[PDB]
Amino acid sequence: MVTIRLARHGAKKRPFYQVVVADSRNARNGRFIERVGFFNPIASEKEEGTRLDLDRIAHWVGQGATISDRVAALIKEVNKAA
Amino acid sequence: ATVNQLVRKPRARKVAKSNVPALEACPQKRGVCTRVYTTTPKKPNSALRKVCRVRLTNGFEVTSYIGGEGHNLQEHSVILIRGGRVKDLPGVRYHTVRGALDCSGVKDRKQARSKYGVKRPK
Amino acid sequence: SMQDPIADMLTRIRNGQAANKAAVTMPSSKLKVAIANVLKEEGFIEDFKVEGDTKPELELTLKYFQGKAVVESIQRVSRPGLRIYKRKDELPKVMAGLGIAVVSTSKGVMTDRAARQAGLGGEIICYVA
């Protein structure tokens, strides 16, 4: 089904995840419906590092989209921080 | 020239043939020396230029120059050929590579050693 | 056959300027008159005069300044063998804006600058320098 999950991008030892809506069958970095954010796990202080378009995510979930565990965690973090 | 004419029959790109077609767009190719001989240069030159007619791995029978002073070549001697003509042997389009398979490096060379397959002296 | 009357007119103007002719006459048409009017407005010719009823003749009075021709160059651009139309962003600047380009727009025949100001392209008739 449609899911919301991290797509690994960046360099070796320096991952940068693009949060994408995509049909689960597709490969991790392959075909995707919509790109709804990003997450930078090695991002330093005085840098944003995370950004999730929450409205779009809400819309897709409403449509019936599953969410990756990591993406769910990110959402929780965003809510707390904000 | 007339726009109508061009539309009717457009402009042909000038298909340039290669001058080293035995390579077949390869940088080098291996072959076996069918025959090793000397030949006379063209009208502004006098020499006995060393050359070997070689059957390549891909079938072609070419003629190849052998640069450097002296060589350890004879019939049934596996060599690598490269691109380059001898302007003054007519119809010779390929050089042997000194410092490859059966071909030895030039003896006692101290300059352009990389061009003649000679290892660095002490 | 005569296949391009505008071109013929332009050629006549060029030849007159070359030959120091005071005026140049040719069969009048509405398009020709419009082009002539544009030319007068921009000041590349002194005057035009349409004369006759059944088959009227346009008579242009050519312009000289220091013994030499005012219209340095005058080339047809769009032509029957090859029509040229441009959009407002593609309108040409002749001689880096010094010369004018006669453009036939939806709102009548006008110079390139005028056409650009209006905001519409059209058939590029000719360049004049």
Place this chain on the structure above:
Amino acid sequence: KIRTLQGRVVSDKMEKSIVVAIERFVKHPIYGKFIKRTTKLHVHDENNECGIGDVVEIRECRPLSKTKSWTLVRVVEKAV
């Protein structure tokens, strides 16, 4: 308002069917000349109403045969 194309009837022999050239006056990619290009289409026409040489308006539809995916909507300039 529906999408529709006009064209001259190039043939009307095959029964309930006509062939409709849809000449378009395109510009040449390179040379810039405007060339007349043609588009033959097998159009379905029930009642065999169309003649040859007839101008006819057509719309696209679900395929009715191997070659026939257009239907006529109205005939115009149907003189002989």
Place this chain on the structure above:
Amino acid sequence: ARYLGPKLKLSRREGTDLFLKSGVRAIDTKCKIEQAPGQHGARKPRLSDYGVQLREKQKVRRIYGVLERQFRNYYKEAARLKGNTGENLLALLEGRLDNVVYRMGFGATRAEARQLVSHKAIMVNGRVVNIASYQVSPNDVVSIREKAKKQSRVKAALELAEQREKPTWLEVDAGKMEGTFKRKPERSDLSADINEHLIVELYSK
């Protein structure tokens, strides 16, 4: 990756003094600065347009100690940047960290400054920077770290620098051994003998 050969040799070839020696002793005393290096120095052949351009480029490269690939990259970057290309190139070269260290005076030559930078003697904004090509930015403090603060070479270099002409685009504290890179120098601020235009033409053949 570095030129390790004779320096006055390079200077003689160029014609000018490239500041490859500390400047304690005059270059006229250290070498025949007028005569070019080698068997055929006592001869000045008439130089082609290409030749003159090449010589100027070589001069600049020798002055800073940049090899060709890096220099070419610098030129491309300058060309990309807005404004005058030669001017931009000069600014970038000046911006280099080894160069700034030399200007401040934490080294008699750029070779010495480069050595210090490589050997981790120099902190940029309180952070040990190791790369000689590091572009220093405006308002950047650059300082000798304490272990290198005891160096007699550093203090001698400071003395020599005091003798030299001070740069307008830096502000340096000799006791603190720290200098603030206030702004990238303008072309009027850099030396007039450099004809950047030749370099631009050469890399835009």
Place this chain on the structure above:
Amino acid sequence: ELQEKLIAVNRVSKTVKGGRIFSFTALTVVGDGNGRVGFGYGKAREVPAAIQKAMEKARRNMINVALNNGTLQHPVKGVHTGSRVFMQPASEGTGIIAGGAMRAVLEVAGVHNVLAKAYGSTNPINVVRATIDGLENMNSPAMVAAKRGKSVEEIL
């Protein structure tokens, strides 16, 4: 202040009963850096003499050129028999992007920012002749205003 530079020096021969007579031709170009440029073609049995003759010729018969802020006034083409030349004004800082002969002529003329190309033959003397002709013909906006009987502001 009359900057001059020699474009090309070429050896030419004449044949006589004895044998060949060689001589040298020098194509030079002088200009004041404010608009005035002039080329000269001198011939003598030796090169320095030839150059001097060329220089004198160039210094005389110069020609004025309408320069707009150290650049061309509009894109201009120029021909002289084989040499057909194109040269286009360019933004400040572009430099002279111009061939050999062409570069020399432009530089002495005083154009600091140009984009040129020499089509056709690139025979130095003809190419220089073509460039000078093109530069000469190139009119300014004040000139166009005068011709058309308008203000310069109406034309822009």
Place this chain on the structure above:
RNA sequence: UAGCUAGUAGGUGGGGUAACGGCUCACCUAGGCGACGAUCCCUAGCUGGUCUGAGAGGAUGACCAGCCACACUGGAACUGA
């Protein structure tokens, strides 16, 4: 390489498909494609892009991503959304 095509082109009616359809079958009509290149022959996975070039172009389609086709060679279906 100038002619090619008899399920061929269209119709009616049955059958078939998840679905329109000569997809298939029976009959009827004699059509259909073609110098805007049909047919035949050679070569080739296509695209975003890549290299080059001032541009217009030219060449190209490794890597990364979208689409397609194949799975020793030739056929076939079954199961199943």
Place this chain on the structure above:
RNA sequence: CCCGCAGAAGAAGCACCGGCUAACUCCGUGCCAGCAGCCGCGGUAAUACGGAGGGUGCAAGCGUUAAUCGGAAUUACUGGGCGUAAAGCGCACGCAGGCGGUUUGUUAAGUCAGAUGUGAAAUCCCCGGGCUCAACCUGGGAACUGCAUCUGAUACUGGCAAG
């Protein structure tokens, strides 16, 4: 990534130097041996072969070969030509095709204008940010010159009607 230890210690080659093209001399050979991208060089004073010294250019690379575009306006749409350089059919008629004097009306096909939709992400470019710097990664823009639909304008070209 940081700290400490010892000691200049373990770390420079490749091509070229007649012109184009930055860099020249001596010796050896003597149209030989050989070189060469082009033009050319060598037949007993070789800056062109081979060695040496000196120099030039790149540098952990440097040359050679292959391949593409460029220069090449040398397929010329932008942007060529055809008296003698390659190029006017031996001459005509004529179907398809290309082009069409002049006026008014009409249409709105070409043309032009505006909007809407799309033109995946990456890539290219601009301003930023993160790896000590760079490469590299990355945020946001711009661009994707296109295509489609709707609504207009009607000067020009096309269609239609009368002249």
